[PDB]
Structure formats: C-alpha cells, structure tokens
Amino acid sequence: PSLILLVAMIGAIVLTMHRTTKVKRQDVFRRNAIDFRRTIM
Amino acid sequence: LAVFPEIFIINATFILLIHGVVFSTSKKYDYPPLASNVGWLGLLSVLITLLLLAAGAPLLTIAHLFWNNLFRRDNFTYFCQIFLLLSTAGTISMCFDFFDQERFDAFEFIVLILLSTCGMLFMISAYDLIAMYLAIELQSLCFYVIAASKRKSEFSTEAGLKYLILGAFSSGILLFGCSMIYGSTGATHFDQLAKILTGYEITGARSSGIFMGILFIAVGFLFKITAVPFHMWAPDIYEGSPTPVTAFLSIAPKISIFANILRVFIYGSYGATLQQIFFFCSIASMILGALAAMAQTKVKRLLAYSSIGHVGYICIGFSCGTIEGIQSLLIGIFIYALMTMDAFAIVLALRQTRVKYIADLGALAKTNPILAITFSITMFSYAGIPPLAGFCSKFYLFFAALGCGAYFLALVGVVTSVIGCFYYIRLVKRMFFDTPRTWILYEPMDRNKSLLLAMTSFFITLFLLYPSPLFSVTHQMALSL
Amino acid sequence: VSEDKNRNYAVVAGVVAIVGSIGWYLK
Amino acid sequence: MVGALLGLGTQMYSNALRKLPYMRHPWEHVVGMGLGAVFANQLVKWDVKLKEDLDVMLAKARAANE
Amino acid sequence: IMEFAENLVLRLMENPEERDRKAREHIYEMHERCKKIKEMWALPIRPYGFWTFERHNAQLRWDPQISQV
Amino acid sequence: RVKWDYRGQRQIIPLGQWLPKVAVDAYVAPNVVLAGQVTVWDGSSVWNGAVLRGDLNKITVGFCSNVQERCVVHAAWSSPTGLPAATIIDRYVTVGAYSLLRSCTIEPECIIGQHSILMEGSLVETRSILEAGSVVPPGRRIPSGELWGGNPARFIRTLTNEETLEIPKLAVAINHLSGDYFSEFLPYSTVYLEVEKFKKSL
Amino acid sequence: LSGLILCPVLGSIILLFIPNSRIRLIRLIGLCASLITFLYSLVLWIQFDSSTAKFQFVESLRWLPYENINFYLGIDGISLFFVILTTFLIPICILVGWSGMRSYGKEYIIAFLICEFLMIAVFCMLDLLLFYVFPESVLIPMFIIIGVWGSRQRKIKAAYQFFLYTLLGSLFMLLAILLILFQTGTTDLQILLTTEFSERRQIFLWIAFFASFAVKVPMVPVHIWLPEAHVEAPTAGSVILAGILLKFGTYGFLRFSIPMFPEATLCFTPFIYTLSAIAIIYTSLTTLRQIDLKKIIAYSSVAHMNLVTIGMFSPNIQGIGGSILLMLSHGLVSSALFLCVGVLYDRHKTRLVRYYGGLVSTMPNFSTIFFSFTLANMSLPGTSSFIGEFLILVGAFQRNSLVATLAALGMILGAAYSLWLYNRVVSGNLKPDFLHKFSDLNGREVFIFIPFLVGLVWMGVYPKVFLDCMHTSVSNLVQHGK
Amino acid sequence: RAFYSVGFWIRETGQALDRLGCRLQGKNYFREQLSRHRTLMNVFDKAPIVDKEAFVAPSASVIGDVHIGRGSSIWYGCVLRGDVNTVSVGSGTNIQDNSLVHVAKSNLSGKVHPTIIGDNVTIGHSAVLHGCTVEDETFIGMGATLLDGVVVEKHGMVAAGALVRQNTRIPSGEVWGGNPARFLRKLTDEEIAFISQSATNYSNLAQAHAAENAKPLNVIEFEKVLRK
Amino acid sequence: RAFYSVGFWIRETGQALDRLGCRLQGKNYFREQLSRHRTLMNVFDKAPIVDKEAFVAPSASVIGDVHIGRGSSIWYGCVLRGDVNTVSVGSGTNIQDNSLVHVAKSNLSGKVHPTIIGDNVTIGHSAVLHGCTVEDETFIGMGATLLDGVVVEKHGMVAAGALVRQNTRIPSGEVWGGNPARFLRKLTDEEIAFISQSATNYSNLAQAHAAENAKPLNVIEFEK
C-alpha cells in the first residue's frame, strides 16, 4: 500500500498536471535557425 | 533475500523516478523529454531483475519470515515470474517508438510500468488473499493511470475511465469474495485456506458463505482477465487506450491473474465445484471470440476480441484440475503471450495510421512484405494453423480437455478454432491476394520491435521443432502447484 | 590529444563490460 | 549449433522488417544466439532432470499404491 | 557386380532390437496413462508450513494465559 | 563567396523545419538535389541528376514511384485555384528520363515517359501511360488508362488492359534496378577519409 | 537415413541467405539440393528389405518427454515409394521453373516454398499426432504455392463454407487422434496397432478420421476443392497437388484406418464402397458438364482416387497393392497431365479450352506425349495405371464382385471421356488466333516429361520392383486386420 | 588511452582496404568516392565575376566567362560554360535547375552573339539557352530550348517545353511554343504581373537557400531539427 | 556478385570501425554530408573504362558498363548511365553537356540493346539518347531526345528538341528534327564541315578545362 499510495501520487500528477508545469510549460519550443522568416510563406 | 527481484525493481523505479523528474524539470538541460532515457534504463531494471530473479532460483525460498505471513515463492512462482519480467521486457521494448515518435515527455509512464511489474511480481508470489488483492490493485492502479494517460485525444480518456470503472468494480467483486471466504473461514493465507477447503463439496455440503466467496473471487478474476460474460468493456478498453498501454494491460495482467488463479483455485480451493463457472466461461469465450472476431473491423478491437477468445481457450485448461490440464493452461499462456506481444509489436509498427480497420491494414503484402508475412504468421498462430505454435497451444489444450473427459468442451473449442482459422485465412487472403484499398505507407519499425517481432516469428514457426523446453517448464510448474 | 569527461567514462565502462563479460563466459 | 543459423536469421529478419538491407556486424553477434541455443539445450536437460525429480516425488505421493 | 555390389548391400543389417524399443515404449505409456489421473494428495508435505511458524512465535505475543502466570 | 567547396553538393538540403526525408530502400542517386519538402517513400528511386526542390507546398513521391535520371520536380507556391498544388507522384509512377514536373498531382500506376514536361494541376489519372516528350498545359487531366502525348498534351489512344497490367511490372522492374544500385552505396561515406588526408596535407 | 534425411530443409535454409537477383545460382543450387534429396530417397529405396514388419529406417528425437510423442520415422512398404514419388516429383516443379527472368514470380521464394519436405515427413511420420500436423501443415505451403504464383481466375479464394467444413473435418480427426492418444497412452503407430479399442468407439473414431481424410480424399459429398484449387493452381502447384496432396488421404486411410480399427473398417466397408463408387460415377459423367481442361483432369483424378479407395478396403494383398500402385500411377499420370495442361496453357497463354486447336501443327510432340499420358489416365492395359486399377478390381478377391460392377460405369465413362477430351484438344485444323507462334516444346520440357513416362512404362511392364518391397508390409497390415 | 584508440582507425583502414582483396570477382568498385570536382568556378581562361549575393548552386559548374547580377540565382545542376563565347546574367534572372546556358562556337554561319540575359528573367527548369540573347523581365519556360540568336523580347513568355528554332526572335508578350518555332497567343497582363512576382519571389527564395552554403558546424547544428 | 557482396560487408565493418571505433574520440568528421556523385565512374561487376585523352566532367556521372575511347568527352552534368548493356562510346565523340545515354533497365518490354555511340559524334545538350546505336560523325541537337533501338546513320544531323522514334534506322545524311520522327532535307556540305570540325573543336576544348587540381584557399574559406 505504500507503493499504491506512491502510484496514486504519480497518477494524480501525470493525469491532472493539466499542462500547467514542465509537462508543457517547458516552452512553446520555437527556434530561429529552424525558421524561414516568412519571406517565402 | 528472497525479495531481491522486488527490492531491486522498487529501488530501480525510485532511482529512475527521481532521475527522470529532476531532469525533465531542469532548465540546464532545456527540460528534455526523459522518456526513452528513463526507458532503456527502464527495461534494463527489468533485465537486471530478470537476472536477479533467474539466478537466485534456490534463493527465492530463503526465508520463513515471509512464508506463513506474506507470500510464498516456489518453482511455479519462479518460472511464471521470469516470464512476467520477460513479457514486461517485450512490452517496454515495443514502446520505444511510442516514446520518441509520438510526443511523450511523460517518462513516469515507464516508472509506472515498473511499479506495475513489481505489483505483478507480488501477484505471482501472492499467497494470501490480502497480498493477492494488494498486488492486484497495485498493478491495476498503475494500469488505470497509464491507460488514462493521453489527455489530448478524448478517445483515450473515456477509455481509461471505463477501464478504471471496470477494474475497480472487478476488484470490488474479488474483494467481496475475499471477504466472504475470510468471514466464513477465519483464514486468508492460502496455506490456511487450503486446509479448510479440503472436502468442502459445496453442491453436496451446505456451505453458502464459502461458496459465494469463491464465486465472487472467480467473477472478479474473470472480470480482470476479461472473460466473456464479464468482459463488458474490454473491446472499448483496448481500442480507446493508446496502443502500447493496450499491449501492456492486455498481455501482462492475463499472465499475472492467471498465475494467481492457479494459486487460489488449484491450491487454496480444489474442487470440481468452482470450475463449472470457468467451463461456462470457456464455452462462451471461445464462442464470442470466434463470432466477434468474424464481426469486427478495427484491428485494435479485432485483437481485443481475439484476446478474449484466446483467454477462453486458456480456461479450458483450468476447466479440469488434472496436471495435464494445468500444463495445457500454462502452455496456452506462453503461446498466447508471445503471440500477443508479436501482434501488438506489429500494431505498434504501424504508427502512421489513426484508428483504422483491416482495410487500411491492407497493402502490407506490397509495402513491407516481410512485415505482412510476419502478420500472417501471427494471425495464423492465433487461429491455430498446424505448422505454427498457436496450434500446439490449442491442440494440447484440447487434448487435456479430452483426457479430462470434457469432450463437449473440446468440441466447442474445435468448432470455434475452425471458425477462427477460416476467418484468419480469409483475412490473410484479403490482405495478400486482393484488396489494395488506399495504400497507406508506414515509417519503418525500430530495431526493438524488429528483433521482438523477428524472434517471436521464429518462435511461432520453429516451435514444434523443439517443444521440449516449454513443455518441461510448464509441467514442472503444474507439478509445483 | 584529449576528450571530454562523461564520455571517456562511458567508453571505460563499455570496456569494463566486454572485458568483464569475457571473463564471465570464460568462467 | 543451430542457434548460429537462427540468430543470423533473427538479425536478417529484423533487417528485412525495418526495410534495411541484409548487411552489418550484428550477424557476427548471432554467435551470442549460438551460446543461447547451447544454454537452452542445457536448460532442457536440467529441466527434464528437475521434472523427473518432481515426478518421482509425485509417485511417492498419491497414496503410494495404497 | 561392378567390383563392390556385394558389400554395397551391407548398408543395413537386421539388428532386430527395434521391437524391444516398442516393448519399452509400452512401459512408458502404461505409466503415462497415469498422467492426468494424478493430482494433489499430500497434506503432510511442507505446504503445512504454518505450524512451523506458529509454534515458533506463539510465545511472544497473541497468547491468552502464558503471560499471566 | 568562394567556389569549389570540398563538400561537393549535399544531396539532402533542408530549410526551415523542412527536411526532405528519404525513406529507406529508396536509392537516392548521389547527383540529385533534394530540398525543402520532398518526402520520397518506400521503394522509390530518385535517379541521377534529378532535382526535387521545395516551395510552400511539398513534393512527395509514392511507393515504388521512381523519378528517373535528370528529372526536375518543383512545386508552385500555392496554386489555390482548383486544388492545393503539391506534387504527389503516387504509387508505382515511373517518371521517366529527363522529364520535368511542377505542382502536378500524378495518380497511381502511371508512366511519365522521357522528356515529358508537365505543369500545374495536371492530375495525370491512374494507370495512364504518357508517350515520350509528353508536354502538358495546366489543368489537362489525362484520364485513366489513356495513352497520351503531343506538345499541347493531345490525347492519342486508350490502352488495352494488358499494358495496364504491365505498368506495375515496369515499376517493380525499376525498383529491382534501384535495389541493385542501393546495394552499391553504404550508410555513411568514405569521402571524409579523403577530406581528412586533404586537411592533413594542409 | 540419419543424415541423408534433412536434405531439403538444409538446402532451403542455407539458400535463404542467398537473395541473389541473378537467378542462375539460386535455380542451379536449389535444383541440385532437390535432386540430391531425390537421390537419397532412391538410395533409401535400394536400402530396402522386403521382409520385415518393422519399419525400414527408424529414427526419432524426443518431442515431449512424458508419453514421448516423438518424431518416429518409418518407411516400410508403402511409405518407401510414397516419399520416393514425392522426391521424384519435387525436382519436377523445380525444373518446370527454369523461366528466364522469373521476377514477380521471385524464383527463390517458390524454390523455398516447394523445397519443404513436410510431405516426406508425413509419409515417414509414424505417430499419428505429428503425422496429423503435417498434411494439415502442408496447407500453409500449398496455399502460397496455389495462388502467389498461381494463375488468377477469380479473386483467389476457395468455397468459404466448404473450406470451413474441410478444416473442421481436419480438426474433427484431431479430436479422434487425441481420444486414441489418451485412450491407452498409445503415442505412436506401432502401439496404436498393438492396442485394441471398443468396437462401439472404433466406428466413431474411424469416421472421425474419415472426415478429414474423405476431405483430403475426394469423395462425392466433399470433393469440390480439387477443380477450383487446380484451375487457379500454378503449373507446379497442380503437379504437387495431384502428385501428393491426394495421396495424403489414401495413405492416411491405409496407415491409420485399416490396421488401426479392424472392426470399424469391417463395419464400414459398404459405406466406403458406395461412397467411392458413386464418386467415380459422378466424376466420370461430370466432364460432360465441365469444359475446363484443368477441371477435366482434376475430375479424372477424383475418379482414380476413389478407385484407390474402392481398393484399399480389402484384406486382399492384391487389393491394397492395387490401391497403392494406383496411387503411384496416379501421382505419375495426373501430374504428367497437369504438366501437359500447364504447357498447353503457357504455350497458348489462354484459359479457355475451346482454344486449344491445331496442336499437331504447333506442338505435335506434345500431341504424342499427351496421348502417352491420356491413355494412362484412362489406364490402357499395359500402362502402370492398368496394373494398379486391375489389382484394385481383383480386390473383389474374397468378395462377391458387386462394387466392381459399379467401377464398371466409373471406369468405362472415364476412358470414354478421356478419349473424347484428347480428341477435343487435338481435333482438327481448328486455326486459332495465336499469330503463327508455334511454341514447340523445350529440351528441358521433354526432360521433365522423361521421368514420368519412364516410371509409368517401367511399372506397366514390370510392377515387381514395386509390389515386391511392399508385400511384406501390406500382408502384416492385413493379418493385423485378421 | 582514448585518442590512442586511433589503432581502431588504423584497423578500419585494414578492413576497409579489404575491399581490394575482395574486388576480384570481376573488376569491381573502381569508384572510391573521391574529393576533386573543379565545378563551382572551373575558370578556363576567363573568370566569373559573380556577385557576393548571386546564389549559385554548388552543382552549377559556371565555367569561364560569366557575370550574374545582385539577387539573381543559378540553381541546382545548371552548367554555364562561358568558355568559347561571353555570357552574362542580369540582377534577378533565376536560371533554374538543369539549365544549359552554355553558348556557342558557331552554327553554320558565324553567329557568335554572346548570350546576355537581363533582369528578373525567370528562366525555367531544364532550360537550354544554347545561343540566344534574352531581354529583361521575360519568363522562359521550364524545358525550353532557346537556340542560336533568338532575341526573346521583354515580357514574352516561352511555353513549357517550348523549343525555339534559330533566329526566331519572339515579339514582346507573344507567348511562343511548339516543337516548331510558332507563336501561341498574347495571354494577358496578369501574365506579366505573375512574371514579375515569380521573378522577385525566386530571387528572395534563392536568398532563402543560404543553408546550401552552411558550414559543417552549422549543418550539424541544424541537425537539431530533431528536437524541434 | 557473391564475393562483391562479401567485400561490401568487410568494407562496411571497416568503415564503421573507423566511424565509431575512433571518431568516437571527439570527431564528427564522418557525419559531414559530403557528396558522392564524385564517383564519376560508378561501377558494378561491370565497370566503366575510359582512356587518357577523354575528359570526363566532375559534375557528370558515368555509371554502368562504359567504354569511353579516345577523344570522347562527357561534359558537365552528363550521365552515361548504362548498367544493362555496355555504353560502347566510340572515339572522339562529344556529349557536350547535360545529356544522357541510357540502356536503362525496364521490364524487357523492348529488349533494351547496347548504345554503340559512334565516332566524332557531337551530341548536344539535354539529349536523352536511350538505347541508341548512333553511328559516327553524327550531330544530335540541344534539348533533344531519342528512343529505343534508333540507328542514327552517318552524318544524320538530328535537330534541337527532336524526338526520334523507336527502331527508326534514320538514313545516312537525313536531317530529322521533329517530335514525330520526320526527314526534312538532305544536309548540305557546309553543315558537314561544321559537324566534322566541331568534333575536333571540343576534342581540344575537352583536352582543355584541365580540372586536375585543387583549390585549398577556397577549402580553407569554406572550412570557416
């Protein structure tokens, strides 16, 4: 049951983090050298 | 000692969980996706365990402190646990594509698979209703979580939700069975419950508490292994959830719950009184497998119903308590697991498709023809075509059913297996000899699926040429029970 | 005539693996 | 033994499934499968030994003709 | 003839023990007919692993009247 | 700017998130120039000198769909008139020698013969053989199974179904040749060794 | 036999590591491996002693320890030349495929999927469980041979309800095999011979084997799979089908019906009598209705095979000798006719039958050889098939000759339509639309014809070397049926 | 120890050299993936004064006497052999892929006529400008074959695959075409609008092919494309 | 070829051993996407043979069985891709540019025959000669195209943009310059002088162009 409470913690985290932290708050992840500056759409 | 397979895979999961969480939440490493890095170390924590578990074969029974309290390891638990870690090894290996290609930074899916594998390692060696339930629910809870993981597509969320409902209700039934049995016997340890339930003869001796208890335990289990009268969501569970988590909760809980059934129903309670429900479940499971497989389109749901039907073909080995029957059941789990790991490795190789049916599965005879050969091999294996391994599984199961005098069970098995053979031969023909049907092209599979598909395809075709090791293993496991 | 840390460690550990395993299948 | 041929196939079959040609040094790591086949046959022998032991234990059990 | 047809036939010879082969096969299968009839009979073998702990730890706690006197 | 780059010419030239990914078993002859968005698919064969550029849209050759020697395949900006004009050379299409393509969406099982110039929106229908020098104006949907040709893309003949059955055999024969060539190249190259020996001469 | 047994599997697997687009090597070496396995089959023939109830070259390897259901490999009597015919015929399929490119028909794939001697296995396999695995097992190789390089006449398929019944019948036999296996632990065929069953159950087990067999055997209620399987089969898929896959059912009856269930066989003699009789009558009259050449030869094959059945019944040593020798002569004659009709297809590239005309101008040597084998499929007295069929007939030896009187119609209509169809094919200067493309036969073509004509004549003028090497075994079988 | 493992670099040279000991079954592998290709300038006796902003594709062997204007491109695989007679390219003339802008020595009568291509001249893929002068702001067709002395007037597009015979200098706006030198039509004004649009867009598109001249460090740093 | 395949295997293991058995020590030199078309004379079990006085341009690939004689030239971008049957190019020919000479493999639909190019043949740019037994002192035009089995006889000046048809044995000295192959005019003698002198013109222009060097200053610049 210790492991089951740990799995409940991991589960409530991976489920209901809701993209509100490093799950997606890392960055939009947009880089410059990989862009074409829209001169050619 | 004696918990070194558990002590390790629990420490390793913590080392991976802390290592993964520290890095994924790290500005210095640009918040990297720790999947496929806590993986790789995940599946090695499996192999090092499988090495810690296989080596200490006499050492697993090294203490008594565990015996009459917590859990009893023996040759059956040892061999079936080397299998669970091996079948968890395949399941993590096939996912490596699902981590990189599919955008998953969620590494803790790995550490949850590892915690579930520890829960299953404690299910196999579970030797007390309390331990059986606790390990069952540890693995079922890890699997509810990792089956409700994908939060973008709503299709996986409701699938995981009905999986949680079905699993929690199945566990409630199983637990009420444990309650009735304990309440009517005052003993939960299988070593204690065995002494009471010798000469119980429910249909002849009035014992309603123990009867309803064993019935509810059998119903909870037949829910967990998604047998026919209680599957009730299993097709939608396998279809909606992502493909690798389906490959996990579709092959490993079967192995584990079936080993647990062999423990409680062949040692904890041994009588022809309870296996009647499993006989009925076998009949209707082979029936439903055959017919619904004839009816389905979506390859994920087709594999769902095929797995239900094959779980049926398993329980005919339990529908008679003879050593030949139990050994047939064990042969059937190994040849159903390796074949299912193969089918799911194939379904995972075709990541490019969305939820698509056998028509979109077509053209594989043209694009990647060796993968089509492998897929036909696996589907034949399910059908039971003689020169393959699934035939050996179904044939030894039917021979045990005949030697056990259940001639009608063998009859329904053979008619359902012939229906399945026809359906899968027709499927292979439709895939190979006609029906081009829109030619969806696939990114290539990675080495991890490649070796697992290749080794398993070799195992299925070159099995009858050497069935001695597996037959010896399963007969030793049956004797040990 | 040099390298970076955290990779030469990895190559030394890979050498330790194959040398160690040789000793294993050798014994 | 036959494990050597099987491994070269497992590796080549793997290459055939990823679309890659049938070429590289892993075909020389199929010697590991030759080691695996020898171990599997060795485990067959060990296993039938243990099963004969369990079978004589069973023969001792089951009322021992009484 | 052709210089060796005589000894060209001694590539088999009678060696008639292959019937004792089936003789002892039959012993095999006469025993094997006891494959499926056998099952659990022992309640005296180590599955009686409870008392060896009960007698072992009964004195420490969970005891009615020993701690009294 | 200086000339004679030691690198030669990199045959796979990405730009702005656009990698012309080559699927394996696709012999991309070393002279070619992939650029922008050119998704060549399984079993394809981009032969000598065949450029494949990249615009707002994306080139894509299909299964077994070879682009033979010295064949330019570009795409117009958007051409939103009737349909988005992203060249899709779909399965088994044998774009023959020294042809030319732009924003046309060829259909399965064609044979775009030698020196056959094309243009936008020329959806050459399925199972269609084009004669040599098959020049096409924008929009001329060459219908199914119909042999064509002519400088303004004038129809010529409909084809017996035996030739239509033979077209896949020609595509897979080209693919056999492509595999025979793919067995001539290795994953990485040995050019770097020569370049290092050049640098150690400096 | 110990080492010389596994020639085709070793050859196939060690060639699998030679993809080799340049076909010459794979063709050459696959053909050499086939020819040497045939050479070892024939030296195994020479190795035979026609004097023992035991099986000639017995070998085994443990397959599952308890009850030891192991690869028990005997070649006495009938199996001796059944495996010989198998090998005799497999290089024929390897040799009908010297096609130049053979590209879509990837040559190494057909080499590897014809060079599987599971037919050798089943004919030597002498424990009816693993023996069961093989005829059902050869269906996976047969299905790929039947359509992957097979001519596509329809969306390739078999009657689905009939196919489900055919495989259901095969698995029904499996339940019977297990019932006998656990009936007295009897693993293999020697001890299934020795043992004795309940007469009440012998009949059930007999008909349960008979389900799968009489599907493999083309009896009247279920035989439709031969025509539909052949007209789509490739040139070398029919040569194997007629050659061996029909012998499967009759050899199954021979080994695992007659000396297995003597009382059940005694009881069901009239059953198989009438079944095979009416089957021969039907398949004799049918080629009236059928104009398709492949269907014609397939139905003549049904006729001959139900003659094999109407003869295998007997405790007549002559009876079962005629049965097995009609099997040999049939694996020669129907496969030679399938070779014929395949050459006649390819040289004409047409799949109508009214279109084969002016053959004496295009390929007159094909006319000669086509007669040399259609006289045989009607069993010209003098041919091998005559010795076979007339020992089938005299099979009414201890009998009272009432089923020979139905074989009357069965064979008279057979010979009649044999001559009618040989005419219909070679008749007249019926000018076809082939654009003066004569397509004279090849030297390799007349070669692959050579061995069938040679076996046919060598039997038809001298059946001793085959009736000998057999009599001891069949007579032992009969006394166990006594 | 590491860096002294160059012995495996030396060991590789052995197993690699083993290609010589293995090229005996027939004369095999005379190719070695060599280094020298005197391509991007290949000055015969006159040098190109191509600008610092005129993107030439490293495949384009611009031989001998050539001059390209600021903003004009010389696309992939287009040989420009200005070896016997002068060549020139105005600012914005995008000589597209597979071109053959190699001039002449003569053809049956003198006709030296150094090829001069003006500004904004969108030349098509696989074009063959053997010996014609081309005027400003015209759009030659992909596949065209412009023969000796064909003064392609301004804003007059040549059709796709449109071979033009000798001396048949097209008029302005007259869209030419056909295997023989015949006119087709006078399309529209939107035609010239799109000509200029495609010219400037191809100019800035060639200015987007700066990755073609990236450095090893910059190539492997673009290989970060996996992360994004 | 079998031993050729084995050679491919030993070389890969060798290249790999260098690539990551010694470039492991800080070297990404192997990873540079350098070109491979510089295999001008790409090879098989059959190889391309070329004599001394035969300029081959480095922008041009010469694949398959080739027999480049004396004076012949393969200028910038050409592809003498002739795997199936030998490209038996004669002496003194002049491909001149991005032309193509194919016996390129099909499904034997027309039994592709070798391309025996003659002598002093000044083939023009973009010509797509394909299974062409073109004889000696012949001219083929700019942007041209040919088809299977063609035999351009002596002095047959095929014109620009032309598309000669299959198996058409063009007569000796007949000018065919159209998409449907069509004789147009008996060639004049001044054209004969031009075609027989442009042969030696390029013969000298190809002995020129003197690639045969290296440009390290540019290599040092492109290094930085």
Ligand SMILES: CCCCC/C=C\C/C=C\C/C=C\C/C=C/CCCC(=O)O[C@H](COC(=O)CCCCCCCCCCCCCCCCC)COP(=O)(O)O[C@@H]1[C@H](O)[C@H](O)[C@@H](O)[C@H](O)[C@H]1O
């Ligand atoms: C005469 C002809 C034959 C001569 C002998 C021929 C063969 C001998 C056989 C085996 C040699 C040993 C190993 C075989 C090779 C294994 C793979 C080694 C791969 C390797 O370099 O990655 C090292 C780590 O490396 C080990 O993780 C550890 C790898 C340790 C390998 C040490 C090898 C050198 C020391 C000497 C051997 C010690 C052991 C001696 C006894 C056993 C010998 C087998 C790290 O580099 P890196 O940062 O650039 O990382 C690589 C990354 O590994 C690649 O996967 C990527 O593709 C690449 O882009 C880059 O990211």
Ligand SMILES: [Zn+2]
């Ligand atoms: Zn020129």
